[PDB]
Nucleic acid binder design. Structure first.
Length: 113
RNA sequence: ACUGAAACUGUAGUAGAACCAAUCGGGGUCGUCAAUA
C-alpha cells in the first residue's frame, strides 16, 4: 500500500474505509523515473549500459560462462591445505592479472603463469 | 499607694506543564608470511 501525501491526506480525511490507489499501475512509472535519472545524470545512452548498473546486474545474475566461482588456487580441486596464495604468487611472477571488471565477466586461469 | 485579664500567625493553594533515550551499522570474510647471503 503505497500512496503520495495527497493520497494519505485523503486516507486521514476519513474514519470510514476508503479506496486505496493501485500502486501496480504506477510501479513502471517509478522504475522508469529511476532509470531515466540514472541515464541522465550518469551520461549514458541506456540505463543498462551505465557501468554501475551493468556491473550490479552481473552480480545479481552471476556468470554465464559456467566457470566455477572459487577463490584463486593453483589446482582445480581445493587442496585440503590453505595454500591458495600459491596462485597469487604465480600471478605475481606470471601475467600479473588484475581482478577482471565485473561487467566483462572474464574468468581467471588456474595457471596465471 | 501595688504586674491587667483573656486571644493558635493562622486560613485557601498538587512543584507542575511539555519532551519517543533516540539516530546510523548484513555477525561478516582469502592471499601469503619472513629477510637475508
Amino acid at each position: 500500500d503505497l500512496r503520495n501525501g495527497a493520497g494519505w491526506r485523503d486516507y486521514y480525511g476519513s474514519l470510514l474505509e476508503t479506496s486505496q490507489p493501485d500502486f501496480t499501475t504506477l510501479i513502471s512509472q517509478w522504475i522508469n523515473a529511476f532509470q531515466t535519472a540514472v541515464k541522465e545524470e550518469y551520461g549514458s545512452s541506456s540505463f543498462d549500459q551505465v557501468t554501475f548498473i551493468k556491473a550490479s546486474g552481473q552480480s545479481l545474475q552471476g556468470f554465464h560462462d559456467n566457470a566455477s566461482i572459487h577463490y584463486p588456487r593453483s589446482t582445480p580441486e581445493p587442496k585440503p591445505d590453505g595454500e591458495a596464495f600459491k596462485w597469487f604468487v604465480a600471478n605475481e611472477k606470471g601475467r600479473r592479472l588484475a581482478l577482471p571488471a565485473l561487467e566483462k565477466s572474464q574468468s581467471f586461469p588456474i595457471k596465471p603463469s
